[PDB]
Design a protein around this nucleic acid. Sequence first.
RNA 1: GGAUUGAAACGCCAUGCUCAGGCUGGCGAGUGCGCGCCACUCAUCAAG
Length: 75
Amino acid sequence: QSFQQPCLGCREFPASFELLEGDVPLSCYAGEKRDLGYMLLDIDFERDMTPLFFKAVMEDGVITPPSRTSPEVRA
RNA sequence: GGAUUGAAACGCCAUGCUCAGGCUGGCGAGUGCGCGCCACUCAUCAAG
């Protein structure tokens, strides 16, 4: 169930979803560290919709962004 | 139930491969070559 069909970015790309109740499956990038550069965390809507960015590293295929509510990522 | 740099977003309108042009003119299967040389139907059996 859902309020609306989720989409992968743009509405024309529907996202099939499913709750995961166990260990995450294996990633194709399991043994690799990859740097993706700075990308978007979220839009700080409270601060007149100021975007904020973080540098994305993709060790083992898992990205760990900082909490967008943290004071040290926000303006 | 506020926000997935999102929410909205046609490649779309239309356009003869056509007009046409012998595969033709002509060329003996032909000259010739015994099925032939031989070989008993035959040795018997009343008519009732």
